[PDB]
Amino acid sequence: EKDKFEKIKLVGKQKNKYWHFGISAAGKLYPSPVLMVSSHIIFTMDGINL
């Protein structure tokens, strides 16, 4: 709703394009079992079409 989950926006507008927030993940086990998440921005044109 309103492109914001918990008052934090995860999709907006860059001129004629729309920008989305994306994350990745990867396992790791030496220090402790963790899930390393990396941040990305994914751009679309209409908002549903990449």
Binding site: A26, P31, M36, S38
Partner: protein
């Protein structure tokens, strides 16, 4: 909650035996350590390149201000800072006509155009060097806009053949306002950073002319510092992997030595970023003799670091050639392992110098971040840490981290606060890039003036 230790930032020694942290701030108050009486320049470019160079060299004789003088200190002027005379009148000029440039760049080829341009510039420089009376210390190659659109490495290697210091300066750097382009705005506006460009150019020119800007003081006496970088010469026939090194040891007293250790030792395999026993023995023997010729004694510890691991086949050779009680330590410095630390309250990033110790053989050094003195970030977005691992040997992790900061504080090519990795690796990579484009150079010089 895990605790991050703090490593106090190292200090560099300027003139008069005084210490500081920012080279830009320590050179202005005290100055360089050695006395060179002047820099006699030489220009190889078009006549408009000569006009641009003389205009810039006259402009930098007087103070230049930045927009923010806390993040980017102002420039007092060349003579005020360095105590030298780099004038725009004692200038040796060798002209390149526009007809020659057009003839050599009209159609030709790619590897033929680059070769022809390099031959032209090198012929001018070498001819002026061998048959002439006037002395030139640094040669300034003013490259027009149509030439820089591979050439730099070829030029530097083919001049390395005769050991002539050189500095390439495109016309867009010195005359950024004239090359408007776009719709009326400069392609790269320097308006707010014009005090940093002068600082960097002046310090590069001073170093390449036999000057000593600053020196390190807080490093363990006796120990050496070797940095190995592997480059893929496989672009040509007989694919191979060349290795290059760089040594940073301390003089017998009150001195610093920072040279290269080259003669690149190849590897016939494809993905084997490693070294053969004989090549490893040769490298260690050469480095040890280089140290012993200066300090008149053998080292106490050898501190080998690289971006890759060390296998047991080379470390055995290293221990076979090491004499007496010279210990060895192998360190691996990865750069982009995905760990990012945020700040819970604030829009500013984590302070530089914070170290997260995972194990007694591993750590997470933070080289980029927020510097309180500059009140700004050394990077963009959230800084990334380097990963330090004591691969082979026995040593304390905190001492290794302190040494890594000390190595980080030794960049002569640019005048900045610090880097994000030890400068030995970066200079070894530069040397390898220069030597790859060459054609079988035997016994190259060990001085960074000819490469950097």
């Amino acid at each position: 909650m895990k605790e991050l230790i703090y490593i106090e930032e190292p200090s560099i020694l300027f003139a008069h035996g005084q210490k500081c942290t920012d080279p830009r701030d320590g050179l202005a108050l005290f100055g360089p350590l050695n006395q060179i009486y002047g820099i006699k320049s030489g220009v190889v470019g078009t006549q408009k390149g000569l006009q641009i160079f003389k205009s810039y060299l006259d402009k930098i004789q007087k103070p230049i201000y930045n927009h923010n003088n806390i993040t980017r200190p102002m420039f007092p002027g060349f003579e005020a800072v360095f105590g030298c005379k780099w004038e725009s009148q004692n200038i040796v000029f060798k002209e390149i006509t526009d007809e020659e440039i057009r003839r050599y760049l009209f159609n030709a080829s790619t590897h033929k155009r680059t070769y022809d341009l390099v031959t032209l510039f090198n012929d001018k420089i070498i001819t002026a060097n061998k048959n002439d009376e006037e002395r030139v210390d640094v040669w300034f190659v003013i490259v027009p806009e149509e030439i820089y659109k591979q050439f730099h490495d070829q030029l530097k290697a083919r001049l390395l053949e005769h050991t002539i210091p050189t500095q390439i300066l495109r016309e867009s750097t010195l005359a950024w306002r004239d090359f408007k382009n776009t719709f009326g705005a400069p392609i790269r506006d320097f308006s707010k950073i014009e005090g940093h460009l002068a600082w960097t150019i002046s310090t590069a020119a001073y170093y390449k002319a036999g000057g000593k800007p600053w020196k390190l003081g807080d490093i363990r006496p006796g120990v050496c510092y070797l940095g190995l970088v592997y480059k893929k010469i496989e672009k040509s026939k007989n694919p191979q992997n060349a290795c290059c090194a760089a040594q940073m040891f301390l003089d017998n007293g009150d001195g610093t030595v920072f040279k290269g250790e080259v003669g690149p030792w190849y590897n016939p395999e494809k993905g084997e970023y490693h070294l053969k026993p004989k090549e490893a023995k040769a490298l260690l023997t050469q480095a040890l003799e280089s140290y012993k010729e200066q300090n008149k004694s053998y080292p106490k510890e050898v501190f080998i670091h690289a971006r890759t691991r060390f296998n047991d086949e080379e470390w055995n050779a290293f221990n076979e050639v090491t004499p007496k009680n010279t210990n060895l330590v192998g360190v691996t410095i990865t750069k982009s392992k995905p760990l990012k630390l945020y700040k819970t309250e604030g829009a500013f990033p984590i302070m530089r110098g914070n170290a997260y110790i995972v194990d007694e053989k591993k750590a997470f050094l933070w080289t980029l971040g927020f510097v309180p003195k500059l009140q700004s970030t050394l990077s963009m977005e959230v800084p990334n840490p380097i990963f330090i691992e004591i691969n082979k040997g026995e040593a304390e992790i905190q001492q290794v981290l302190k040494d890594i900061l000390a190595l980080t504080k030794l960049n002569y090519n640019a005048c900045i606060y610090a880097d994000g990795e030890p400068v030995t690796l970066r200079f070894a990579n530069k040397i390898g890039e220069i030597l790859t484009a060459s054609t079988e150079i035997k016994t190259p010089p060990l001085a960074f003036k000819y490469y950097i």
